[PDB]
Amino acid sequence: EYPTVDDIPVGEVRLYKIGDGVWSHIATQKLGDTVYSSNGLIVRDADELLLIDTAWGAKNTVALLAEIEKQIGLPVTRSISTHFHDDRVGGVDVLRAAGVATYTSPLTRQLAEAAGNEVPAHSLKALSSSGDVVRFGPVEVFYPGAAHSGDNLVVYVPAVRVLFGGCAVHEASRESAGNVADANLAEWPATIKRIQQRYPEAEVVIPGHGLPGGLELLQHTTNVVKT
């Protein structure tokens, strides 16, 4: 049932229900002669939605908003981007045009500017140091330290124990680290250990790319990373 590249054309978006008031969104994108899929999250708060990450570019992000309106029918009023790459901030300008208040950490804003990428309009204070956690509506936003990138964040939904690990967590089937050009391989194991110690009751862990699993994806990541 979980959507894969085999069942999503570039430009279409699927939603997948994870728990009470929580969905993932799945989109596809072509870089080389390589098609990839990518995951974000949607979380209900009263009569509005918090979005976690864009759908990897402007075209997919317009389609994401249309699919949310078809299937859920509540407005997206705020978003958080979990690092500075195009699968997280690509389409922020679509979000802004639609009246969404877009956020991320100050470091993500700085790195996205340096990369030429779109930049969320607002900073999350108090996320500058490894181990820092803030509340944001129905979630917790945690900065566990450098890993896939220097600025990567994870997002936990306490009411239903769902952790979105983003691109700092690899899916079960992946055995290589992927794109490491912004990675800190030396800190990556310590970063995974902070996530494990902070969220020991998580029932679902969603990676930035691929199939959701449970807490076993965290040790799996450490294993892929060392090698």
Q: Which does 154 bind (CB under 5 to 8 A by kind): Zn ion, Mg ion, none?
A: none
Edge-to-edge, what's the strand order for the sheet holding 139-143? 132-136, 139-143, 154-157, 162-166, 204-207
3-state secondary structure 75-135: CEEEEECCCCCHHHHCCHHHHHHCCCEEEECHHHHHHHHHHCCCCCCEECCCCCCCCEEEE
Q: Does 210 bind Zn ion (CB under 5 A)?
A: no
Provide, rounded to whole angstroms, the least separation between the CB of residue 208 and Zn ion.
Answer: 4
Complex with Mg ion: residue 67 or 87, whichever CB lies closer = 87
Q: Which does 167 bind (CB under 5 to 8 A by kind): Zn ion, Mg ion, none?
A: Zn ion
Q: Does 169 bind Zn ion (CB under 5 A)?
A: no
Complex with Zn ion: residue 59 or 85, whichever CB lies closer = 85
> What amino acid is encoded at 81 in this protein?
S
Binder among 22, 52, 167, 204 for Zn ion (CB under 5 A): 167
Provide, rounded to whole angstroms, the least separation between the CB of residue 31 and Mg ion.
Answer: 11
Measured in degrees and rounded to the nearest 5, phi and psi for residue 66 equal -65, -40
Provide, rounded to whole angstroms, the least separation between the CB of residue 38 and Zn ion.
Answer: 6
